[PDB]
Amino acid sequence: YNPEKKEMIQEVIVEEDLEPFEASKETAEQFKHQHGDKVDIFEIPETGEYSVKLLKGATLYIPKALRFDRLVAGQIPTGWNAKTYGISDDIISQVDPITLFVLVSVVEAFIASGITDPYEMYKYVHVSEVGNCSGSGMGGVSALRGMFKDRFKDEPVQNDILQESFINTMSAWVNMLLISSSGPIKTPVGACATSVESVDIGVETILSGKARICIVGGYDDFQEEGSFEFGNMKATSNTLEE
Amino acid sequence: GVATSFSRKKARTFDSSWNWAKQSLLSLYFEIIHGVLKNVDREVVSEAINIMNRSNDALIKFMEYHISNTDETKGENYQLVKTLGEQLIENCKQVLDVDPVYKDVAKPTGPKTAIDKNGNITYSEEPREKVRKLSQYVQEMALGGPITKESMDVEDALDKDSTKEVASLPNKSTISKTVSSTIPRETIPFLHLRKKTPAGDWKYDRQLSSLFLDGLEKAAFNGVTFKDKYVLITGAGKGSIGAEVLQGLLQGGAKVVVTTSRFSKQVTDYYQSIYAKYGAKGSTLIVVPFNQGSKQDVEALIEFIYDTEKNGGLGWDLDAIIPFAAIPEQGIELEHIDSKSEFAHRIMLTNILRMMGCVKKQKSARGIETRPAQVILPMSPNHGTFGGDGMYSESKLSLETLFNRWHSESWANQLTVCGAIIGWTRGTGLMSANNIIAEGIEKMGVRTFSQKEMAFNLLGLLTPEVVELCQKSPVMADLNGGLQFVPELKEFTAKLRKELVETSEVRKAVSIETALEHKVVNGNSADAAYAQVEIQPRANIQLDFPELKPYKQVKQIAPAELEGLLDLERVIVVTGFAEVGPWGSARTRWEMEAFGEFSLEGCVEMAWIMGFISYHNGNLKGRPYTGWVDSKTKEPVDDKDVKAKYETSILEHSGIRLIEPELFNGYNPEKKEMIQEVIVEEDLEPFEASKETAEQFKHQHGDKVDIFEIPETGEYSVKLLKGATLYIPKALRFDRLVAGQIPTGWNAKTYGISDDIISQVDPITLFVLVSVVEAFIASGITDPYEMYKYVHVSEVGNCSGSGMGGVSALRGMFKDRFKDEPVQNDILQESFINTMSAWVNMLLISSSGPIKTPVGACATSVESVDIGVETILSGKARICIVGGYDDFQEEGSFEFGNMKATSNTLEEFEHGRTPAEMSRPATTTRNGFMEAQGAGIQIIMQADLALKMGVPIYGIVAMAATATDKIGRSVPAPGKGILTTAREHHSSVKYASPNLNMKYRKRQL
Amino acid sequence: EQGIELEHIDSKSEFAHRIMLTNILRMMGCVKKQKSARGIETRPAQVILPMSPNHGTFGGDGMYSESKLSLETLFNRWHSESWANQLTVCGAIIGW
Amino acid sequence: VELMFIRSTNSWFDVTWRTFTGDFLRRVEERFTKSKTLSLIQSYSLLDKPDEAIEKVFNAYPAARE
Amino acid sequence: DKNESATINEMMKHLGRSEGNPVIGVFQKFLTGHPKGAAGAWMMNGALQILNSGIIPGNRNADNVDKILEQFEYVLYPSKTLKTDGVRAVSITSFGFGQKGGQAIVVHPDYLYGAITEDRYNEYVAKVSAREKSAYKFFHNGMIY
Amino acid sequence: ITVARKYLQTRWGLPSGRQDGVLLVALSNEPAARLGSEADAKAFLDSMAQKYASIVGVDLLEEITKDHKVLA
Amino acid sequence: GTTPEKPEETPLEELAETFQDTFSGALGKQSSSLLSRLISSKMPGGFT
């Protein structure tokens, strides 16, 4: 993502027929289904591959590039890598970037509490009395790119991309990889207040007598599309004025 | 006609009698308690038989608890069910580990034709004299009559005490003198077997015929088993001898294949309901679609039956075929024999022969030479004796060759023929053209039959004596009831029919003329102060607040110690609720969920929701009108006429159904728009852009585009060069075509949300705004601000949430921006899960109380409730909105398809499922969930506050909990962490906890 | 049709059944229509039907006996329909 | 009845006003019946003892009292 | 639908449910489909309607109940509507993506009124009877306009 | 917008000061989707040229040599 | 097309032999869809 060169696509009508190109059978029928009259597809009888003639009145999408005025952000230091904390590539190449920030923050928080092995809690407290009451404002935002933009472009996207999008999954992965509690999970969405709401939900979970211990916090990622949408709301500092 | 109907993937197995026994017993229990069935009704016996026929240990543990915990003090009908029950338990235990039985116990009816004063012909089947049991029916059949002349009293308690007739259901009654010895010499019974004489005719054999009737006497007392009998039966649709046979088979735990011509939801349900009332222990019912007129379906059907469960067949081996399929041909004389009759001749003969041919091939194949299949052929006694039957008689008479061919060919060890000469069978208990004259024939000294009697007769040809007999020689059973001996039957029948049509028609004309004479002589003062006023009901739609009982009745329910014991500040209570979803409101969905049909009030709300009807108060074409009015034609509609006018349309456009594109921004899952990146192999034809837009192309493409000012216009030319990238649209065809969508025409306008709001907020927010209003109305809170009479501004909370949120606004900010479509600048604020609650506060409540929005995927509502409760007990909020809400869009539909969470709709259609029957929980064949949309909302309060405000109280939220599962590597796998709500310690469990006993707890207080 | 037992009834036997029965009926149907057309009610046509005495008594005849035995319905239908003044049936039980 | 029917003369002031209250009682029956019935007020003659003819309608549709 | 049946059956076993007293399942999603986040709110609306009628609606698409589910003695799977002498309490169980179980018990509201005095109850009854009329006034006005 | 200005100069006879105002009434009264044919695009501007008329108060051979030069 | 009864516990050495017995040599549906998408997405302009 280079905010000086923000990739869009403009719809244009083919005023005059395109030079044919070869597709598979499958992919050509996909062009024919979309375009109807406005495409011609013909088996090349030697190969089996099809020719695809985009006719006058067909629609195309031609890429363009906006220059965007928000060039600056508070980013994690360059070279930060979940590997250096000792998260496996199985996990890294599966889970959304924001989940990696959370997994590192939960470990590094048990270390601050002198709790090197999460299971030590279950000497004192029943399995059903550790809760997670943390949450995000937007969640797995990179996984939403996957399931709205990248699919649309028929890029390769993992089939389970939708489960990584959900705000309640960063907490799923913390339970699935560290805690193994069967205690409460009450995930808040509080936009920019989600952390203090988290704490509130957390406390009232402990006084209710549902949980003796509770992870509590918040987590949020910066991507291209939120950067842009906060710019259109005029919430963020315009960097060129700055 | 000859089109293939049969697939294996459309075959529906019904086998879960273990579950249907418990449902049938509870359905009988409450029917007796609500006095729908009395101790005189025969249905309580009929129903008892079907619970004995399914008797197992689980069903006795079940009946013991339900019958040993009824308080007989509570009413006369509670005494009845406990007396009946105790007996039905004693029976069920006697018959545990004993084979189940076809035993029909219905009151055998006769026909009755009546013509009134005004010449209207009425038909009614009418309880006979001296035949009030099937025992009696076999005696009557044995004695014959005066015309059949060729030239015992077991007291019961039917129709006075069925609880005593229940007691006598296992008691296997043995008789000395059989009804073989009742048959008076020089008289032919009405039911009789025949024997082939060396000349080659078939005559009444007395001794065969005795054996048959003796089996039939015992069937009537003790009942018949069909355990381990496997049957193919065709033409067994609703209202046929076919279907009253099917009941009897299943009732004796037969395993039956049943073929339908017309396979549909409506039929698959008929069959579900027969199996779930009749299918005894071990019974099974496979329903396959089938054309008997198709050669290739007959070949297929027997291949599917015989084939191994491994190659996708059944693994059965037929012990009886009953090929009773027919197409009716009427008014087809010999000059009119055409394609219909030629096609019927194939269903009713050549393909019967091809189906018996087939089972011989599949039985031989596997060297099966000792397990033959009784073919029961439906014969007529009347070949060409009526006429206008087309090739019907030519079809039936040619089946009489199988009696000879059995001795003359190589198939006698695979097949056995048992030809039934089925006589006059009164179609239904309504007016069949044939029925009205039944009474008239019977006066000759002859018998006609209900279908239950003709079923009984043919199930007697599957008893183990006439099965043992079929295996020696063929069996001709004459179940014609003496109609051989009425002579010139065609003219005799047509006399009787003439004399009813005449006697009616005459008496209808002489009636009409004597009421026009009177009207002329005495005018319109004798016939006008006479014609009464009728009152068509209107639709008083009710809020369905709960019935409050007088205090004296309420103290009976709760323990006396409870008064003063609970702190009601700390009891949570649901005060109202509502929803928007596929069946409209909480009101209309309840009418569908519970009853399956809409009331007059349900039709009107549905019609109003979907904007089919609108109110009008003023002038309609001059006239002054106040009522409903078709929303499109503005033509006045009465409430009685809403069902006729609009039901069909409401049911087509409500529920789970094919995704309607106009609802989802033209999303057509058959045509799902993607874009493929291609490289321009050769330079494009220039196009004109603005200056701005051309610099945008140049910035992206660099070398690979050329942009040149056109010096006249100022506009630029844009030449896309070789090596430039393009995006060409394509279209996936997607396999998820069905979803549970809000009914078509639902519009926030009809609730009175302004266009300012509609054209601003995400669709899901509109479902929520309507659900919160319609929930305050359920709580009798018409003005939200009324709350602030009782409670501070800071003590109303919103603890509702979504799994994904404003999903249409994510399309805006990921897809539509990318395509430089116009998208509102504030689109990002609508995406957020915490904004539906923002808009509820901003447009209705104006609380400054808690807001704690959960994300719980498919559990967000129960988490919402939990967060809600704990917010009220913390003492942060006295009132709390609580619920959940979620929208269906293109992109989630797709992503749930890639996870293989949702039902694939094209597989569903292979199995011949309609969209209605595609969500089927707890089912053998369940294959993924049905995505839906909408919102639910509840209002919860302190009970203290609820009683002060006098809001209705719909229930008490006693408990609410959330639990994670364990270590795993699968986010969508469900688990067991919610078991921790039942966590207790049972080490020290010898003596009672005094803390559980409320009396103790009150003494301490 | 010979050596065609009931397991072997196929297209030949289904086609024979049309020659030896349904199209016989269609040919008598036809003459009734052409005779009625012209109001001929006093010049009937004797149909001589070749009957067998042996229906299924040998076997391996395919649908031969099912064909022949179904012609025995015309004896009843003559009294029960509207074609007795155009056609008269005369069934011959032709022996060996 | 209080405002249009006159106790002293034991009659309706105007017959168009009797019509008015009959038409109204018919609308109660339309609103509160479940099922097409024949009307309890056949002739508006019956209204001429109007307390008896009110009880008759609000006995058979007692929801209307509430 | 096996995992849920299995947990209900193990709660009921551990709390000494009477053998022969199975809870009756209701499967309202047969009719509405699964509205993921709204799922449990519709189940709850449905449960309060069951509570105040004692009508248990049947899964009308339960053709054939999985043989695997007969091992669960403590659950019944009905295919028709059962009109009962009353329902005192209803469980509502929701399983989510991301290890997100939930249970709620809803107790019949006539159990509340045993805890209060005859004067207080009679006062409340009046107050509600008034509200319900007002609410009906409002409903039908807002519906037609 | 070259052809949309050139259609308002030949059909209606509007110069480049009024052609601006006709395109500003065509922006406030923008169509919902892509106009299909060139005949729809003209029918549209004919409507917006008679709606400019209302607001301001205004009341109302060699395409073969082209088709060769295209080929060349 | 072929799938043994329990492939998920069967090693890829022993599966490869159960397919090869009934395998013609051709690329089938799934691996002709992935060579088309390698060439479409990861090869330059002209290179089919």
Ligand SMILES: *P(=O)(O)OCC(C)(C)[C@@H](O)C(N)=O
């Ligand atoms: P894994 O054993 O986690 O199973 C995943 C599926 C999709 C099968 C499961 O979550 C489901 N939807 O039943």
